[PDB]
């Protein structure tokens, strides 16, 4: 059964609640964005509408097949009437796609559900700084002050001079980068931008890419492995015995693979700064953890909410233990008596 805290009061509408059945009362399903652990459900014989951004109805379309009829797609930044209730999206500094939701209730009350985010200044620009939110729906992944992770620029540029030293030392080089979901396309398009080749990937990669309308993306990607010296691999084949394999069927282009994992964060982070970060080795192969997140910080959640007042904040992650719940509860006052609100 549904969880209270997916569930949007005073209407009849539920946020990420696709693998619960029919859920009752539920007139419209909105979906923040196409991550598995908030899309799971979703199928080709879903009957009900579904609400979310232009970029994720094209993923729901190609790669979940949902077909045409349900599939409701709209702009960000704009006022929409769903089923009599007033609704805005705003971008979530998440995946592509990803959406926050503003939620205008026929009672005056206003909810902002962030689904996953990345908590940024920029937002205290948007359409939020024009009125009250009485209660944050709040992506509460990293919610303690130990989480601790480098701006997505400072990654970026270690992984930019990383992989242009290695290729410029030994032009026989590969340079592998792990995926296993949509997020973090940066990675693989900076390092191939510094190095002027095409990403190759498969098939399936591909085609998930040219679902998410990133700008002259035709110039940037190919299925042509040979052509390319950045390649994409699943998450689970960046280590040594996969790495070895994939070099194998190379043909002898290559001598050398450098590799990048992007993570979220590790407790490495608690020590390490970026500027340190070494790889592991075995033989002519190494590979780089680079702590890439797509979710906010400690310090960023907390100067947003302290930024936004509200009345009330529902987590939506760490929710399914006591210790977690009373942690960020805890937080959540502190925040409060600090700002004065
Ligand atoms: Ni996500």
């Not at 949902?66 to 797609?73: A, M, T």
């Not at 702590?291 to 929710?319: C, D, G």
Request: proline content about 5%.
């Amino acid at each position: 059964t549904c969880p209270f805290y997916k569930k949007i009061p005073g209407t009849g509408f539920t946020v990420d609640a696709f693998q619960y059945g029919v859920v009752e009362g539920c007139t419209a399903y909105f979906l923040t964005h196409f991550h598995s652990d908030h899309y799971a459900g979703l199928s080709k014989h879903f009957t009900f509408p579904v609400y979310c951004s232009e970029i994720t109805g094209n993923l729901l379309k190609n790669k979940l097949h949902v077909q045409e009829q349900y599939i409701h797609p709209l702009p960000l930044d704009t006022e929409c009437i769903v089923n009599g209730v007033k609704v805005v999206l705003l971008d979530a500094n998440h995946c592509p796609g990803a959406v926050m939701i503003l939620f205008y209730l026929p009672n005056g009350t206003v909810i902002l559900h962030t689904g996953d985010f990345r908590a940024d200044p920029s937002m205290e620009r948007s359409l939020l700084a024009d009125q009250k939110v009485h209660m944050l729906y709040l992506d509460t992944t990293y919610c303690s002050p130990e989480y601790t992770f480098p701006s997505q620029q400072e990654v970026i540029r270690f992984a930019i001079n990383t992989a242009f030293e290695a290729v410029t030392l030994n032009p026989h080089a590969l340079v592998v980068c792990g995926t296993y979901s949509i997020g973090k396309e940066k990675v693989f398009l900076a390092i191939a931008d510094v190095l002027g080749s095409k990403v190759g990937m498969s098939q399936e990669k591909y085609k998930t890419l040219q679902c998410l309308n990133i700008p002259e993306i035709n110039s940037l990607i190919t299925t042509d492995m040979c052509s390319s010296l950045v390649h994409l691999l699943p998450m689970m084949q960046i280590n040594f015995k996969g790495l070895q394999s994939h070099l194998k069927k190379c043909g002898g282009k290559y001598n050398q693979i450098l590799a990048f994992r992007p993570t979220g964060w590790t407790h490495s982070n608690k020590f390490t700064r970026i500027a340190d970060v070494i790889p592991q080795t075995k033989g002519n192969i190494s590979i780089y953890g680079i702590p890439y997140s797509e979710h906010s910080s400690y310090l960023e959640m907390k100067r947003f909410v302290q930024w936004l007042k509200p009345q009330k904040i529902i987590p939506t992650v760490n929710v399914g233990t006591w210790k977690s719940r009373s942690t960020m509860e805890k937080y959540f006052r502190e925040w409060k008596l600090e700002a004065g609100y």
